Structure formats: structure tokens, C-alpha cells
Design a protein around this nucleic acid. Structure first.
Lengths: 142, 142
DNA sequence: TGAGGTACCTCA
DNA sequence: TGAGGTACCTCA
């Protein structure tokens, strides 16, 4: 039921598995499924192209990006398997530690992207999905 | 007929004779009567009080300020008796040269303040009053 | 967060 | 100029 709001284009990159961690200033004890919602902040087309070029160099020239980075909607989910300090992050993930310098680094696995994305209004930190949205989101994962 | 738009509170200080020069980046050959309009930009109350305190120290503790600094209206007129370079301004007006560091300094005399101020839309540089406004403004000078 | 008030920027 | 589009800031 719990959800995290993330700015595009990073939000869709997370549920695609292209972005593997998300950094925040705060720790969460939450583990397991964490839904990912895009915030309402629309990224400029310049931001999107520049971030895609960067991720092409980190992951490979043939990485398959989403066609669109919709804002203000529920995108999918990840498994939040750990929430590491920056010191722990460098120790455990040397190969990607450069990908977040935040005080706490959310380590994400098993991303799933919803085929039908639903409009939603987010909140700070981890918040709970409304039950109707949650129900439809689970169906749309099949 | 010619008019200059000036930000408040400087605009009303000009037609009161409290402010004696107005600086601009450009020269004008205009001499004689120059109407003064306030721009549409409303000054914060903090700006007004700070500028009044400064002019109190330059002119005297008992200087009589206007009760209000209305925006977007025709305030009065001055006689533009010269348009001096900054070098000329320092040479001719040593006692007030510190009051403008602009490339050109408009030297104003014989300020008159209209008792009824009329709403107006300004333009850059020196512009011409509409004839109906001009007619009423001259009457209101009596 | 998302929303909106506002200061800043630009103007065939 | 004055007007408005927009980025920035703040939020009992």
C-alpha cells in the first residue's frame, strides 16, 4: 500500500529498472513493495534528453527508455530491499555508488511498470495509496 | 505635451521638489515642461519608508512627504532645464551630484503637483500625452 | 506533495 | 511601458 513520489524523468527510470537507487535526506524502515508515483513537476524536454544521454553512457547505448515520462500518476512499483546510509552505500554497491550522494539511498529491485497509469496526488516521504487506486494498480500488474 | 514615466516613490518626490534630478541611460534634447507619470510598479511600504528616511537626512527632518505614492497615474510636471552627462553633472551641481550616478542626469526645476491625478499608461523614454489628458492636466494646475 | 502567490524576465 | 508567462518560494 505504501508509495513514494519521485520527479520525472527519474520516476519512470526507476520502474523501468534503468535507475536502480533513489536518494533522500531521510531514512525509512519500510522494506518490500514500494509503489512509485510521478510528482506533478513536468521535466523540460532538455532535462529528459540530457538525462537519457547520461543513462545511455552508464547502462549502454541501446538502453530502452520509456516513450513518455507522465507526471502526476502512479507508474509502478519496486521492492525496497534496503535503505542505506551513504557510507553503507559506498561499501555495499561500489559499482553504482556514484549514482547517489544522498544521506540515505533506497536500494530498489524487481521493478514493475503499470501498463495503465493512474492520476494521483502525492505526499512527502512514504504515504499510503487510496484503496481503490491500490486495487486497480495490483490488477494492472498481471 | 511630453511626459516621462518614473517609478514611485521617486515619481512623487520629483513633482514635490524633494527629488531634484532623475537619471537615465539616454540623453534627451527636450527642454522645458516635462510631465511626470508614475509607472505601474507599486513600491513596497518598506521601500517607501527607507527612501523617506534617506531624503529626511538629505533635506531635513521636517521635509513634507506626500501621504501616498499612487501608481499608474499622471502626477504633475517639472521644467527640464538641462540634460547633463555624469561628468557635467559633477561639475555643475557638486552639492547634489551624489544623488545620481546615471549616464545622463535630468535637471528639474519648478515642480508642480496635480491636485487630481489621472490614470495613465506610460511608455519608455519621453512620450506624448493624449490631448484629453493633457487638457485636464493643465486645468488642474491652476 | 501540490497549489498558488509573487518576483523575475521578456517583449516582430 | 505594461502585461503576461513562468520559475521560484512558501506552506497553523
Amino acid at each position: 500500500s505504501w508509495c513514494l513520489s519521485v520527479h520525472q524523468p527519474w520516476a519512470s527510470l526507476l520502474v523501468r529498472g534503468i535507475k536502480r537507487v533513489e536518494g533522500r535526506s531521510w531514512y525509512t524502515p519500510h522494506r518490500g513493495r514500494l509503489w512509485i508515483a510521478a510528482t506533478a513537476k513536468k521535466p523540460s524536454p532538455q532535462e529528459v534528453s540530457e538525462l537519457q544521454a547520461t543513462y545511455r553512457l552508464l547502462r549502454g547505448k541501446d538502453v530502452e527508455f520509456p516513450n513518455d515520462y507522465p507526471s502526476g500518476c502512479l507508474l509502478g512499483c519496486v521492492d525496497l530491499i534496503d535503505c542505506l546510509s551513504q557510507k553503507q552505500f559506498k561499501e555495499q554497491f561500489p559499482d553504482i555508488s556514484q549514482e547517489s550522494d544522498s544521506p540515505f539511498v533506497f536500494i530498489c529491485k524487481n521493478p514493475q511498470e503499470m501498463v495503465v497509469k493512474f492520476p494521483i496526488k502525492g505526499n512527502p516521504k512514504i504515504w499510503k495509496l487510496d484503496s481503490k487506486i491500490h486495487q486497480g494498480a495490483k490488477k494492472g500488474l498481471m
